[PDB]
Enzyme design. Structure first.
Site: not given
Ligand SMILES: *[C@@H]1O[C@H](CO)[C@@H](O[C@@H]2O[C@H](CO)[C@@H](O[C@@H]3O[C@H](CO)[C@@H](O)[C@H](O[C@H]4O[C@H](CO)[C@@H](O)[C@H](O)[C@@H]4O)[C@@H]3O[C@@H]3OC[C@@H](O)[C@H](O)[C@H]3O)[C@H](O)[C@H]2NC(C)=O)[C@H](O[C@@H]2O[C@@H](C)[C@@H](O)[C@@H](O)[C@@H]2O)[C@H]1NC(C)=O
Ligand SMILES: *[C@@H]1O[C@H](CO)[C@@H](O[C@@H]2O[C@H](CO)[C@@H](O[C@@H]3O[C@H](CO)[C@@H](O)[C@H](O[C@H]4O[C@H](CO)[C@@H](O)[C@H](O)[C@@H]4O)[C@@H]3O[C@@H]3OC[C@@H](O)[C@H](O)[C@H]3O)[C@H](O)[C@H]2NC(C)=O)[C@H](O[C@@H]2O[C@@H](C)[C@@H](O)[C@@H](O)[C@@H]2O)[C@H]1NC(C)=O
Ligand SMILES: *[C@@H]1O[C@H](CO)[C@@H](O[C@@H]2O[C@H](CO)[C@@H](O[C@@H]3O[C@H](CO)[C@@H](O)[C@H](O)[C@@H]3O[C@@H]3OC[C@@H](O)[C@H](O)[C@H]3O)[C@H](O)[C@H]2NC(C)=O)[C@H](O[C@@H]2O[C@@H](C)[C@@H](O)[C@@H](O)[C@@H]2O)[C@H]1NC(C)=O
Ligand SMILES: *[C@@H]1O[C@H](CO)[C@@H](O[C@@H]2O[C@H](CO)[C@@H](O[C@@H]3O[C@H](CO)[C@@H](O)[C@H](O)[C@@H]3O[C@@H]3OC[C@@H](O)[C@H](O)[C@H]3O)[C@H](O)[C@H]2NC(C)=O)[C@H](O[C@@H]2O[C@@H](C)[C@@H](O)[C@@H](O)[C@@H]2O)[C@H]1NC(C)=O
Ligand SMILES: *[C@@H]1O[C@H](CO)[C@@H](O[C@@H]2O[C@H](CO)[C@@H](O)[C@H](O)[C@H]2NC(C)=O)[C@H](O)[C@H]1NC(C)=O
Ligand SMILES: *[C@@H]1O[C@H](CO)[C@@H](O[C@@H]2O[C@H](CO)[C@@H](O)[C@H](O)[C@H]2NC(C)=O)[C@H](O)[C@H]1NC(C)=O
Ligand SMILES: *[C@@H]1O[C@H](CO)[C@@H](O)[C@H](O)[C@H]1NC(C)=O
Ligand SMILES: *[C@@H]1O[C@H](CO)[C@@H](O)[C@H](O)[C@H]1NC(C)=O
Ligand SMILES: *[C@@H]1O[C@H](CO)[C@@H](O)[C@H](O)[C@H]1NC(C)=O
Ligand SMILES: *[C@@H]1O[C@H](CO)[C@@H](O)[C@H](O)[C@H]1NC(C)=O
Ligand SMILES: *[C@@H]1O[C@H](CO)[C@@H](O)[C@H](O)[C@H]1NC(C)=O
Ligand SMILES: *[C@@H]1O[C@H](CO)[C@@H](O)[C@H](O)[C@H]1NC(C)=O
Ligand SMILES: *[C@@H]1O[C@H](CO)[C@@H](O)[C@H](O)[C@H]1NC(C)=O
Ligand SMILES: *[C@@H]1O[C@H](CO)[C@@H](O)[C@H](O)[C@H]1NC(C)=O
Ligand SMILES: *[C@H]1O[C@H](CO)[C@@H](O)[C@H](O)[C@H]1NC(C)=O
Ligand SMILES: *[C@H]1O[C@H](CO)[C@@H](O)[C@H](O)[C@H]1NC(C)=O
Ligand SMILES: *[C@H]1O[C@H](CO)[C@@H](O)[C@H](O)[C@H]1NC(C)=O
Ligand SMILES: *[C@H]1O[C@H](CO)[C@@H](O)[C@H](O)[C@H]1NC(C)=O
Ligand SMILES: OC[C@H]1O[C@H](O)[C@H](F)[C@@H](O)[C@@H]1O
Ligand SMILES: OC[C@H]1O[C@H](O)[C@H](F)[C@@H](O)[C@@H]1O
Ligand SMILES: [Zn+2]
Lengths: 499, 499
Positions: B93, B188, B328, B407
Site C-alpha cells: 500500500r 483524522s 492500532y 495499516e
C-alpha cells in the site's frame, strides 16, 4: 582631490583616511538583509523560494541548503537590532515576507495578525535605537499560492494582488516607515527565474534546462519584466495618492553593473557594451524615466516585447521618488550571435553580447570577487571604479535621481573555519574601495546619493548557493545561530561610522 | 479451535504455530507507506504537510523533523521494491502525492509528466515482482495552493478538484492498479486538522490553541468530514461509471478502534461506549452504508451537523467496493460533559465520553503501545482482541463488507540505538498477536477480510512525531538513508509469509 585605488593592495581600511565624516552629515550608513534569507519559515506561509528550493534541491545551493531555519531572525530579531546598535548604524534595509503577513496571498483571504506584530516589534525596536528602516516589499518570496494560481508575475493578476499587499503594509507600518522599496532587482526574476531557471520559480525552455516544469526562456522574461513594472508603478501610484500623509518616499531596486568593451578599439565590442547598458539597465530605466523600452530593445526583441498602453506608459513613467541601486561588479562585453530561432534561445542572448572579466589583451578587471570551484575560468572579479561609473551614468542618463545604495558586499567561502571567517580582510578591502569611489563620485559629479547599505548584516542563506558562501559583516555559527558576532569587517565598519 | 493471547508474554512469534498458511491461499500480505512520509519534496510541489511542519515546527514533532528528505523514496523506490521482494510480499500500500502529479492542484493548470513517470516506474516494478499495489489517492498531503485558495476540505470546491485529480490517476495508472483507496482515515483530518490542530492544516478555535491561524473546533470538523464524504463518493462514482473496464475496486480508509466500558456494570459508562462507536465509526460508516449520519449525532450536534440532499445521500450510500480498515488500539470509555457553549468546545466533546487505557478497577487494557515521556499517565496501551471485535462489528453492523487491513503496527523509540532498534521484539509481539486474532475472527465469524498490510515498510517521518519514533519493519539510518535493512520484525514477517 580624491584618489581611490583600483587594484590590490588597498589602503582605504584606515579610518584616518576614509570615514563617515568624509561624506555629508546627513548620509545614512547601514546594512541590509532579506526575509527569506534570514527569518525561517516559522510563523509564515510558503513561498516560491521554499517551493523552488524543495522541488529542485540541487538548484538551492551545492549543499542543498535553504531558508527553513537559517539564522532565525524570526526568534532573534533583537540580536539583529543589537548588531546595528553596535555599529551605530543609521539605516537598515530589510524585507517583509508577503507570506508572513498574508499567507494566502490575496488580502481578502485574511491577514496574519501575529506576522504583522512581528514587523511592528522590529520597526519599533529599530526606531528606538535611531535606525531608519528601508523596507523592501518584495524580495522575491512570492506566496506559493499565487504562483500556483496564475504563475505569479507571468500573469497580470499579480498587479492587483501586489497592490493589495502593499496597501496593507502602508496602512500597518507607514506611520513609522518612510523609505519603501517595491521589487528587489528588477532584472533578476525575469532572467534567472524565467530565463535561465537558476532562481525561483524555475521556469524555462525545455532544451535550456529539462528540469524546468514549464516556460519559455525567449518570451517569459519579457512578460514578467513588463508585469513587474506595471505592479511596481501601481503600488507607487497607490502610495503617492493614498499615503502622502505619511511623508515617506518609495522606489524600485535595480541591480546595476558597469560595462566596458572587451576590446576598447574594436567598434563591435564598443557597440556590444552600449547594447549591454540598454538591455541590462535600460530595460527598466527606459520605462521608469520615459514610459517606453529602449529603441534597441524594441528593434531586436520585436514581437516578443510587450507594449505599454498610453495609460500604462503614464503610470510607469516617473514612478519613483528615489532609486535603490545595488552594485557588485562590472563586466567586459564583446559581440555574440543572437540565435532567435534556436530552441535554446534566451532573452539574455538578445543583447548580442558575451560578458567576461578578462579583456582581449588578458587584463583581469580587478581583484577576485567570487571563486567558482567547478570552473575557475568562471571566477568573478570586481572593479571599484564601476560604482563611480554607474552613479555618474544614472545622474547623466536618467535625470539626476535621488539614490540610495541598497546593496554592496562580497562573499567569502563557506569552507573557511570560524577563525578564517572572522578575519575577513578581503571584505574590508571590497567595502572600503567602493566607499572611496562613492565619496569621489558624490564630490566630483554631484550625484545625489544619500545612503549606503552594505550587503549583509550577518551570514544568511544565499540564493543559489546555500550556506556555501558567507556575506555577513557579522558571523553566525550554523550549529548555534543565536549570536551575530562582528567580523573584522563589522569592526572596521563600526570605526568607519564612528571614527 | 483457535486460542490467541491477550497479555504478555506472547508465543505467536513462532512460525510453526502461526503463519501465512494459517490463512486462505489467496490472502494478501504486505506492508504500507505514505508519500509525505517517505518520498521527500524533490520533484513535487508543496502541500499542507510541508506548510504545517514549516509554519508550526514544534507541531511537526519534538525534533522539529519533517518530510523534506526523509528516507528518499523518490531516489530509492527500487530499494523499497527490494524490501518487498525480500519479504515475498504480495501487496504494497503506497500513496500518490497529489503535489507530485498536479503541483498546481487543479488539473487544468497542467500535470507533471515526470511525476507521473515516477509512479509508472514504481508500479511496473512492483507488478514485475508479483506485488499487488493498493494505492491511496489522498494520504493527507493536499497541495498547499488549494488550502490557500479555499481552505481545502473546508470548502465544497474540493470535490471537483479531488475528482479531476482522481480521474488523472485512474487514466494513468488504472490499467495496472486494481485496488484504490480514496481518503486515508476519514476521522483524522477533521478532528486533528480542524478540531485539535495537532495535524495540518492546523485550524481550531482561538482558545483551544492560540497558534491556530483560524478555525472553529466546534463546527469545522463536521464541515470537513461532510466534504470528505462527498469528495470520496464523487470519486467512487467516477471510478465505477468511467473506469469499470479496468476491473478494479475502490474504497475509503477508516481508522478503527474498539471501545469497552470504563466500568462494565455502570450504565453511564456502557452508554458512553456505545456513543463512542457511533461518533468515531458511525460518523462515516452511517453515511457510507445508509446515506445519513447516526441519530445520536443528529440529536447531539444539531445545527452544527450538515445534511445530505437526497442526491448526495444516494451518491454517498454504498460508495465502496471494499473498506480499508486501519487498526492500532482500543479504549475504555466513561461519561464526560459536553460544554457546547464553552469557547474551547471541540467536535470531539460531542460524544460525551472520556477515553482511557485503564478501567475503573485499575486494569490496564494490555501491553504498552506508546510511551509518552512528557506525561506517563498519557501512555497508550494495546489490545489484540480489539481487531477481532472491530472486524466482527463491521460484519454485523455494516452489512458484511469486503475488508482489507490497510495499516496495523507499533512504534519503538527514536532514542534507541541501531542495535536496539534492529532487535524490535516488541514489534513481532504486536504484529503476531493481532494476526492471531485476525485469523481467529475470519474463521469464527466469517468476516470477509482478504489482506493485511502492516504499518510501516521502513522507518519514515511520523506525523506529529518527526523521527522520534520508528514504525518500520526495515531500518533506515538517518545519516545515510539508502539502505532499508530488515529488522528482527521484518525477518520474522519474512518467515511468517514463507514458512
Ligand atoms: C521616449 O518616449 C517617446 C514616446 O512617448 C519616444 O518617441 C516615440 O518613439 C517611437 C519609436 O519608438 C516613435 O514611434 C514611431 O512613430 C513612427 C512615426 O509615426 C513609427 O512608424 C514607428 O512605428 C514603427 O516602428 C516601431 C518600432 O519603433 C514598430 O513597433 C512599429 O510596428 C512600426 O514598425 C513608431 O510608431 C510607433 O509604432 C508602434 C505603435 O504602437 C506606437 O505607439 C507608435 O508610436 C514615436 O513617434 C515617438 N513619439 C514621439 C512623441 O516622438 C522616444 O523615442 C526616442 O525618440 C524618438 C524620436 C525616436 O528617435 C526613438 O528612436 C527614440 O527611442 C523615447 N525616448 C527614449 C530615450 O527611449
Ligand atoms: C437510515 O436512513 C433513513 C433515511 O433514509 C433513516 O430514516 C429516517 O430517519 C429520520 C430521522 O433521522 C426520519 O426523519 C424524521 O421524519 C420525521 C417523520 O416525518 C421527523 O420529524 C424528523 O425530523 C425531526 O427530527 C430531526 C432529527 O431526526 C430534526 O433534524 C428535524 O428538524 C425534526 O426535528 C425526521 O424528519 C427529518 O427531519 C429533517 C429533514 O430535513 C429530513 O429529511 C426529515 O426526514 C425519517 O422519516 C426516516 N426515513 C424513513 C424513510 O424512515 C434511518 O433512521 C433510522 O430509522 C428511522 C426509523 C429512525 O428510527 C432513526 O432514528 C434511525 O436512525 C437511518 N438508519 C440508520 C441506522 O441511521
Ligand atoms: C583589438 O581589435 C582591433 C580591431 O579589430 C584588433 O586589430 C585588428 O586585428 C586584426 C587581427 O585580428 C587585424 O586584421 C588582420 O590584419 C593582418 C595584417 O594585414 C591581416 O593579414 C589579417 O588577415 C587581418 O585582416 C583582416 O582579415 C579579416 C578581414 O575581414 C578584415 O577586413 C581584415 O581586417 C586588423 O588590422 C587590426 N585592426 C587594426 C585597427 O589594427 C586588435 O588585434 C590586436 O592588434 C592587431 C594589430 C593584431 O596585432 C592582432 O593580432 C592583435 O590581436 C584587437 N586587440 C586584441 C588585443 O585582440
Ligand atoms: C462500578 O460502577 C458501579 C455502579 O455505579 C459502582 O457501584 C456503585 O458505587 C457507588 C459508590 O460510588 C455506590 O453508591 C454508594 O453506595 C453507598 C452504600 O450505600 C452510599 O453510602 C453512597 O452514598 C453511594 O450511594 C450513592 O450516592 C449517590 C446517589 O446519587 C446514588 O443514588 C447512590 O447510588 C452504589 O451502590 C454502587 N452500585 C451498585 C450497583 O453496587 C462500582 O463501585 C465500586 O463498587 C461499589 C460497590 C463501591 O464498593 C464502590 O466503592 C466501588 O468503586 C464501580 N466500580 C468501580 C470499580 O469504580
Ligand atoms: C517561445 O514562444 C515563442 C512565441 O510563442 C515561440 O516562437 C514562435 O514559435 C512559433 C512556432 O514556430 C513561430 O511560428 C513564431 O514565429 C514564433 N513567434 C515569434 C514571436 O518568435 C517559440 O517557439 C517558443 N519557444 C519555446 C521553446 O517553446
Ligand atoms: C463556532 O461557530 C458557531 C456557529 O457559527 C458559533 O456558535 C454560534 O455562536 C453564535 C454567536 O454566539 C451563537 O449566536 C449561535 O447560537 C451559535 N450557533 C450554534 C450553531 O451553536 C460559535 O461561537 C463559534 N465558535 C468560535 C470559537 O468562534
Ligand atoms: C576622517 O577622514 C578624513 C579624510 O577625509 C580625515 O580628515 C578625518 O580626520 C578623519 N576622521 C577621524 C576622526 O579620523
Ligand atoms: C485608494 O483608497 C481609496 C479608498 O480605500 C480607493 O477608493 C482608491 O481607489 C484607492 N487607490 C489608488 C491607488 O488610488
Ligand atoms: C544551445 O545553447 C548552448 C548554450 O547556450 C550552446 O552551447 C549550444 O551550442 C546551443 N546549441 C544549438 C543547437 O544551438
Ligand atoms: C554615534 O554616532 C553619533 C553621530 O556621529 C556620535 O556622535 C556618537 O558618539 C556615536 N556613538 C558611538 C558609541 O560611537
Ligand atoms: C503453519 O502454521 C500451521 C498452524 O495453523 C501449522 O500447522 C503449519 O505446519 C505451519 N507451517 C509451517 C511450514 O511451519
Ligand atoms: C466521465 O467522463 C465522461 C467523458 O470524459 C464525462 O462526460 C462524464 O461526465 C464523466 N463522469 C462521471 C463521474 O460520470
Ligand atoms: C477549557 O478546556 C480545557 C481542556 O478542554 C479545560 O481543561 C478547561 O477547564 C476548559 N475551561 C473552561 C472555561 O471551560
Ligand atoms: C514465495 O511465496 C510462494 C507462495 O507461497 C512460495 O511458493 C515461494 O517458495 C516463496 N519464495 C520464497 C523465496 O520464499
Ligand atoms: C539535479 O536535479 C535535476 C532535477 O531536479 C536533474 O535534472 C539534474 O540531472 C540534476 N543535476 C545534476 C548536475 O546532477
Ligand atoms: C548557543 O549560543 C548561545 C549564545 O552564544 C548560548 O547562550 C547558548 O547557551 C548556546 N547553546 C548551546 C546548546 O550551546
Ligand atoms: C510552539 O509554537 C507555537 C507557535 O508556533 C507557540 O504558540 C507555542 O508557545 C510554542 N509551544 C511551546 C510548548 O513552546
Ligand atoms: C551509505 O550507504 C550506502 C549503502 O549502504 C553505501 O553504499 C554508501 O557508500 C554510503 N555512503 C556513505 C557516505 O557512507
Ligand atoms: O548575492 C548577494 C545578494 O545580492 C543582492 C540580492 F538582493 C541578495 O538577496 C543576495 O543575497
Ligand atoms: O501513526 C502510525 C501511522 O498511522 C496510520 C497513518 F495513516 C500513518 O500515516 C501513520 O504514520
Ligand atoms: Zn523544508
Amino acid at each position: 582631490e580624491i584618489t581611490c585605488q583600483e587594484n590590490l593592495p588597498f589602503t582605504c581600511g584606515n579610518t584616518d583616511a576614509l570615514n563617515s565624516s568624509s561624506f555629508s552629515s546627513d548620509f545614512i550608513f547601514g546594512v541590509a538583509s532579506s526575509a527569506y534569507q534570514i527569518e525561517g519559515t516559522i510563523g509564515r506561509g510558503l513561498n516560491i523560494w521554499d517551493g523552488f528550493t524543495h522541488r529542485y534541491p540541487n538548484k538551492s545551493g551545492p549543499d542543498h541548503g535553504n531558508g527553513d531555519t537559517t539564522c532565525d531572525s524570526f526568534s532573534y530579531w533583537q540580536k539583529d537590532i543589537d548588531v546595528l546598535d553596535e555599529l551605530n548604524a543609521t539605516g537598515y534595509r530589510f524585507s517583509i515576507a508577503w507570506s508572513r503577513i498574508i499567507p494566502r496571498g490575496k488580502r481578502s483571504r485574511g491577514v496574519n495578525e501575529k506576522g504583522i506584530d512581528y514587523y511592528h516589534g522590529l520597526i519599533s525596536g529599530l526606531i528606538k535605537k535611531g535606525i531608519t528602516p528601508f523596507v523592501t516589499l518584495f524580495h522575491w518570496d512570492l506566496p506559493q499560492t499565487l504562483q500556483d494560481e496564475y504563475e505569479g508575475f507571468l500573469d497580470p493578476q499579480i498587479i492587483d494582488d501586489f497592490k493589495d499587499y502593499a496597501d496593507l503594509c502602508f496602512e500597518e507600518f507607514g506611520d513609522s516607515v518612510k523609505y519603501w522599496l517595491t521589487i528587489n532587482q528588477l532584472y533578476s526574476v525575469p532572467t534567472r527565474g524565467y530565463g535561465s531557471a537558476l532562481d525561483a520559480p524555475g521556469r524555462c525552455s525545455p532544451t535550456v534546462d529539462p528540469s524546468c516544469y514549464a516556460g519559455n526562456s525567449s518570451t517569459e522574461p519579457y512578460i514578467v519584466a513588463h508585469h513587474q513594472l506595471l505592479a511596481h508603478a501601481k503600488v507607487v501610484d497607490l502610495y503617492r495618492k493614498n499615503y502622502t500623509h505619511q511623508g515617506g518616499k518609495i522606489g524600485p531596486t535595480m541591480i546595476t553593473r558597469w560595462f566596458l568593451p572587451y576590446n576598447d578599439t574594436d567598434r563591435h565590442s564598443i557597440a556590444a557594451t552600449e547594447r549591454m547598458k540598454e538591455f541590462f539597465l535600460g530595460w527598466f530605466m527606459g520605462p521608469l524615466t520615459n514610459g517606453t523600452y529602449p529603441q534597441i530593445m524594441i528593434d531586436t526583441v520585436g514581437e516578443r516585447l510587450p507594449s505599454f498602453s498610453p495609460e500604462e506608459s503614464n503610470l510607469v513613467k516617473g514612478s519613483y521618488d528615489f532609486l535603490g541601486l545595488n552594485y557588485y561588479f562590472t563586466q567586459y562585453a564583446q559581440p555574440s550571435p543572437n540565435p532567435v530561432n534556436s530552441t535554446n534561445h534566451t532573452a539574455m542572448m538578445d543583447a548580442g553580447a558575451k560578458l567576461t572579466y578578462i579583456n582581449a589583451s588578458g587584463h583581469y578587471i580587478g581583484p577576485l570577487f567570487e571563486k567558482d570551484k567547478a570552473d575557475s575560468t568562471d571566477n568573478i572579479y570586481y572593479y571599484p571604479k564601476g560604482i563611480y561609473s554607474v552613479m555618474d551614468y544614472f545622474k547623466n542618463k536618467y535625470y539626476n535621481p535621488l539614490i540610495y545604495v541598497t546593496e554592496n558586499g562580497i562573499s567569502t567561502p563557506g569552507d573557511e573555519n570560524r577563525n578564517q571567517s572572522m578575519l575577513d580582510y578581503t571584505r574590508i578591502d571590497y567595502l572600503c574601495s567602493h566607499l572611496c569611489f562613492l565619496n569621489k563620485v558624490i564630490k566630483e559629479k554631484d550625484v545625489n546619493v544619500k545612503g549606503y547599505l552594505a550587503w549583509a548584516l550577518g551570514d544568511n542563506y544565499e540564493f543559489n548557493k546555500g550556506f556555501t558562501v558567507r556575506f555577513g559583516l557579522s558571523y553566525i555559527d550554523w550549529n548555534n545561530v543565536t549570536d551575530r558576532d562582528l567580523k573584522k569587517s563589522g569592526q572596521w565598519y563600526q570605526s568607519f561610522i564612528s571614527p
